[PDB]
Amino acid sequence: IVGGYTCGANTVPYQVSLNSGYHFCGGSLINSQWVVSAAHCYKSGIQVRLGEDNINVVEGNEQFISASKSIVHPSYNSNTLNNDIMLIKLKSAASLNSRVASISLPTSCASAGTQCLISGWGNTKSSGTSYPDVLKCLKAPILSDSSCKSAYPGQITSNMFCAGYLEGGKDSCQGDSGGPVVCSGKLQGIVSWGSGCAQKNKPGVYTKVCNYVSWIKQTIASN
Ligand SMILES: NCc1ccccc1
Ligand SMILES: [Ca+2]
């Protein structure tokens, strides 16, 4: 997250870190047994880390649970990032309390102009590299469909939305991939793609979670 702020330990209790020997992506806990992340974050050997603030120090609220199954969306296209969503099943159910909790799935799609909360352990620099230890947050508005299409002509599908700041300076970044965009207490987006981070006229692009709720529900009911 570039241009954001320190969230505060355990204030984003649905945020997870995906670990394959090191943090590599975010995700969102949606059920005691399931995490939603980006399909571009797929890899074998994922450990889900819940209850994290500092990802380099054991602070006492963590739950580390290995993935038992990963399910990339059937229509994921890694070239366009259309349908950039994946479900991860946990080997055992997380214990839910204040510091670890699920986030609700949306009923209705989110509105242009709504301020959402984006969070993660990704790079904090637009130019160069610096990776934080504690969870960072950014409040960012959903942009209009026409603005999003102007920023990325020919590339925005109905399964994507932009959020952020056309002026630059505030954005999600590498390492935030797969993490949550929460609007009015619902998971509306997944950190998906863009062109660099916090550059002028290149806001973040996010998977539009509302379009996937039927697939998520059916998949969790059968796996
Ligand atoms: N600045 C949007 C973004 C986020 C994660 C990965 C690539 C691009
Ligand atoms: Ca920790």
Return d(Cα 43, Cα 86) in angstroms, integer: 11
Cα 12 to ligand 2 centroid, rounded to whole Å: 14
Q: How was this structure determined?
A: X-ray
Return d(Cα 44, Cα 113) in angstroms, integer: 37
Cβ(2) – ligand 1 distance below 6 Å = no
Helix (H, G, I), strand (E, B) or coil at 116: strand
Helix (H, G, I), strand (E, B) or coil at 20: coil
The candidate with the shortest Cα–Cα distance to 193, out of 83, 103, 104, 55, is 83
Tokens matching residue 29:
């806990």
Domains of the chain: 1-12+103-210 (2.40.10.10), 13-102+211-223 (2.40.10.10)
Q: Tell me the CA distances in angstroms from 108 to 23, 100, 143, 144, 184, one per residue in order.
A: 32, 25, 17, 17, 11
Other Cβ atoms within 10 Å of 99 Cβ, number = 18
- Report yes or no: 203 and 150 within 8 Å, Cβ to Cβ: no
- Report yes or no: 183 and 110 within 8 Å, Cβ to Cβ: yes
Tokens matching residue 62:
């963590």
Could you tell me which residues are beta bridge partners of residue 37?
A: 86
Q: Which one-letter amino acid corresponds to residue 101? A: A
Other Cβ atoms within 10 Å of 58 Cβ, number = 9
Residue 52 is assigned to a ligand binding site: yes
The DSSP 8-state label assigned to residue 77 in this structure reads B
The candidate with the shortest Cα–Cα distance to 101, out of 32, 24, 33, 53, is 32
The candidate with the shortest Cα–Cα distance to 131, out of 214, 80, 197, 191, is 197
Place of tokens 């996010």: 206
Cβ(176) – ligand 1 distance below 6 Å = yes
Nearest residue CA, atom 4 of ligand 1?
A: 173
- Report yes or no: 129 and 10 within 8 Å, Cβ to Cβ: no
Tokens matching residue 177:
């991939």
Phi first, then psi, for residue 214 (nearest 5°) are -65, -45
Examine the residue annotation and report whether 195 is marked as an active-site residue of this protein: no
Cβ(204) – ligand 1 distance below 6 Å = yes
Residue 62 is assigned to a ligand binding site: yes
Tokens matching residue 78:
């890694």
Residue 122 is assigned to a ligand binding site: no
Examine the residue annotation and report whether 147 is marked as an active-site residue of this protein: no
Which candidate in 17, 23, 37, 40 is catalytic? Answer: 40
The enclosing H or E element of 120 equals: strand 115-120
Phi first, then psi, for residue 196 (nearest 5°) are 65, -155
The candidate with the shortest Cα–Cα distance to 31, out of 10, 44, 41, 16, is 16
Q: Tell me the CA distances in angstroms from 9 to 13, 14, 16, 65, 109, one per residue in order.
A: 9, 12, 13, 20, 29
Could you tell me which residues are beta bridge partners of residue 207?
A: 160, 190
Examine the residue annotation and report whether 84 is marked as an active-site residue of this protein: yes
Alpha helices, DSSP H only, in 108-157?
145-151
Resolution of the experimentally solved model in angstroms: 1.4
